[PDB]
């Protein structure tokens with residue numbers, strides 16, 4: 299079974315690291331493949347990696363055709379990236395991918411309790427995204443589901459792609 | 469309210485610069501702020517700014533050209549993003565399409581020194597207004613690159629995260645995409661070798 303997954307979300311919010319776990323270099327356009335088994339079904343999952351910068355807004359629609367599931371990411375140490383979910387990512391994805399299931403993914407979960415992150419966000423009167431805030435946003439945009447993960451610690455990563463696969467298969 | 473009605477954004481570059489003040493005030497304001505407070509920000513120009521706040525910054529500037537960023541609470545990525553919006557909203561790209569063709573031709577020259585000299589000759593063909601602003605932005609990006617051990621933004625990374633803003637490329641097909649690899653390289657060269665291209669003693 300072949301299914302197509304596209305991942306989108308703010309620049310540097312952790313998209314490529316999430317794919318790879320399954321360097322400091324921004325992606326322009328890359329493709330990967332992952333094999334996943336869920337519910338007795340074996341799926342060959344094509345992973346379409348995209349650029350999060352607005353510089354590449356006119357390029358991203360090259361990745362959207364015939365998509366089976368969307369990973370829509372933000373980073374838990376970036377409340378800006380969460381605010382960009384309803385402001386930028388959801389309108390774009392729903393414009394180009396109607397009726398495609400969206401997994402809302404909170405990346406970098408390891409930084410929520412990180413003292414350095416909390417100290418640095420504090421200087422800007424910010425704090426890490428709370429789990430409830432992520433879940434509420436997933437509810438708000440009508441996501442297929444909400445998942446938090448850390449590519450760094452691997453926490454929740456397997457669960458993200460299993461959910462994405464089940465979404466694609468359904 | 470709506471950006472169409474702005475007399476500052478989405479209007480020709482020549483209407484928001486003068487011979488006496490060749491850098492748009494908004495661009496000077498954003499870049500000075502970023503140099504003062506943002507040079508140690510990991511992934512400055514890579515990390516996406518808050519889109520809603522970027523638009524808010526633009527509207528507040530519309531209302532008051534004397535807007536004080538040191539006074540407001542816009543974060544560095546918001547200022548960086550709003551700065552990019554100025555260039556993406558220009559009626560025509562900062563680097564004119566006719567110049568991009570000439571730059572691509574120059575870049576194919578195999579001999580390194582000949583290549584760099586050829587690229588500099590193309591610079592002299594830019595409209596003077598565009599040249600001054602292009603110089604200003606590239607020189608800023610070069611200064612950002614000097615702190616790349618901390619902010620991780622090499623000239624390569626800065627090019628990847630800024631050249632389409634400056635050139636407004638055709639991204640309509642895969643073949644069009646591969647044809648843009650030269651643009652990335654060209655802007656990387658202008659940033660890395662900024663002194664050769666833009667210094668005057």
Ligand SMILES: Nc1nc2c(ncn2[C@@H]2O[C@H](COP(=O)(O)OP(=O)(O)O)[C@@H](O)[C@H]2O)c(=O)[nH]1
Nearest residue numbers: 309310311312313314315316406408448449450
């Ligand atoms: N602490 C932490 N850092 C991460 C994680 N995932 C990615 N990063 C870092 O975030 C930066 C950008 O990640 P990347 O996946 O390339 O971003 P994207 O492809 O632009 O969304 C890199 O410095 C990564 O090391 C994570 O789960 N935890």
Ligand SMILES: [Cl-]
Nearest residue numbers: 480481559560
């Ligand atoms: Cl113009």
Ligand SMILES: [Cl-]
Nearest residue numbers: 661662663664
């Ligand atoms: Cl040089």
Ligand SMILES: [Mg+2]
Nearest residue numbers: 313314324325
């Ligand atoms: Mg990437």
